[PDB]
Design a protein around this ligand. Structure first.
Ligand code: JED
Length: 468
């Protein structure tokens, strides 16, 4: 993911491309903060293409809609031509990069938070590689910066700290008396005690800290390019709301004709899916039935800004409808402040004994762009959803959806995952927001789409602990 330059300007981007690149060279950078710019070289000139993400997907101007920036780049490199990634040397979005950090502070961190193989890189004008080894000690390796090249006092001179770190991860530096300086995993600084979330939110709100943590998580997306072949099949093309936002094959819900754009999320399980299309309503009810799901979480209006986000897949109040082999009666609608509850009865046509109640929780007040200013409404809604799921003996995974089923869906599921760890293990437990997002993202592409949702997840977890 070296093509992503987090701290450069358009002018700097143009100079890089016209001097260090050729025609077909490109890079992506953050813009209007929240937006992104694909800066490409074509015929000795630079084109700047806009990428928008209000929380649902990456929308490339003159292109398609994508689950991740890595996925957008992989597509255009396998299909203006995107030929040569212009590499970034800047290590700010690296998990191990701590910058302004002292030898005592680094030793504190490796001693408490660290285990064997834990390492970090901190900053005169030179850098330090601090490693923990044992079962233990901490070793400090000097990193000379000479003419914008990095070295450990001898051997190879690297173009960036990244190339240095990667090199010494594969071939570890061996101390004269046997000890191999293994770089096994970055120091896990994002793992915190739940009860101290407020202190971390304060530090993250300083000069922002939330932007560095999120982009460091975004940098790990290139490790999640799992196959999405079933979704690409000719027979399955129009079963997708967005042609390029597909389910991973290894986690997709298989229907026992077997396709739905949905994925099982294992942290109580979830099904992360898209908003129904006219032609997938019957596939949605087959899935709910088969999975034995008793709760559905809808986090979108049917129509937002004049565009259909999800078709009406449920009958009107008191009405009975058949959707293929599946039968649904809307028993009762209950309208709360932020949401509407719909009590549905699902059964197989021709089998009276298969009947079960499906509680549909429709959140109706989420803003068209961005996230709610306060998490109270979302938390209260999640609490009710949790209590319903809990009261139902042997219930299947909770179905969660919005439009593409990755942004608002991912956000709701992750909050639910974190507030659940707290429920079980109590206020004195460890929680790691990006480790949780990364674990959910390996089960469905681009789960949690923006920095605004990322910050909202932190605000949600903080507000839950405050009222505990
Ligand atoms: C100065 C400074 C600021 C922020 C960080 C930092 C550290 C980590 C980390 O590895 O603990 C991560 C992560 C993360 C965590 C686990 C997994 Br699996 C995937 C991503 N995401 N964002 C992060 N930011 C480090 C130094």
């Amino acid at each position: 993911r070296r093509w992503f330059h987090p701290n450069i300007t358009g002018v700097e981007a143009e100079n890089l491309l016209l001097t260090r690149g050729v025609d077909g060279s490109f890079l992506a950078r953050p813009s209007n903060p929240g937006d992104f710019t694909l800066s490409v070289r074509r015929n000795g000139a630079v084109t700047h293409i806009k990428i928008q993400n209000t929380g649902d997907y990456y929308d490339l101007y003159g292109g398609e809609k994508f689950a991740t920036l890595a996925e957008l780049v992989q597509y255009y490199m396998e299909h203006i031509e995107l030929k040569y990634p212009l590499n970034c040397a800047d290590p700010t979005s690296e998990r191990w990069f701590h910058g302004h950090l002292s030898g005592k502070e680094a030793e504190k961190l490796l001693t408490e938070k660290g285990k064997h193989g834990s390492f970090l890189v901190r900053e005169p004008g030179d850098f330090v590689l601090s490693v923990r080894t044992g079962d233990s000690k901490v070793t400090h390796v000097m990193i000379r910066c000479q003419e914008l090249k990095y070295d450990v006092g001898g051997g190879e001179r690297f173009d960036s700290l990244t190339d240095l770190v990667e090199h010494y991860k594969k071939n570890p530096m061996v101390e004269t008396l046997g000890t191999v300086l293994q770089l096994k995993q970055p120091l896990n600084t994002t793992r915190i005690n739940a009860a101290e979330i407020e202190s971390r939110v304060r530090e993250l709100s300083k000069l922002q800290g939330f932007w560095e943590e999120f982009e460091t998580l975004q940098q790990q997306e290139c490790k999640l390019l799992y196959s999405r072949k079933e979704g690409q099949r000719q027979e399955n093309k129009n079963k997708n709301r967005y042609k390029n936002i597909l389910p991973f094959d290894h986690t997709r819900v298989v229907l026992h004709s077997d396709y739905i754009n949905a994925n099982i999320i294992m942290p109580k399980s979830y099904i992360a899916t898209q908003g129904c299309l006219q032609n997938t309503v019957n596939d949605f009810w087959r899935m709910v039935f088969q999975e034995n799901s008793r709760v559905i979480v809808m986090t979108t209006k049917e129509v937002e800004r004049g565009k259909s986000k999800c078709v009406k897949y449920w009958p009107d109040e008191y009405a009975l409808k058949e959707y293929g082999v599946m039968r649904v009666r809307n028993v009762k609608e209950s309208a709360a402040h932020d949401y509407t509850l719909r009590e549905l009865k699902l059964s197989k046509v021709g089998q009276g004994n298969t009947e079960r109640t499906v509680w549909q929780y429709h959140f109706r007040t989420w803003p068209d762009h961005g996230v709610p200013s306060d998490p109270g409404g979302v938390l209260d809604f999640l609490e009710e959803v949790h209590h319903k799921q809990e009261s139902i003996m042997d219930a299947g995974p909770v179905v969660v959806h919005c439009s593409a089923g990755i942004g608002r869906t991912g956000t709701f599921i992750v909050i639910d995952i974190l507030i659940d760890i707290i429920r079980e293990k109590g206020v004195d437990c460890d929680i790691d927001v990006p480790k949780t997002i990364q674990m959910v993202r390996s089960q469905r592409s681009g789960m949690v789409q923006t920095e605004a949702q990322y910050r909202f997840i932190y605000m949600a977890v903080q507000h839950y602990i405050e009222t505990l």
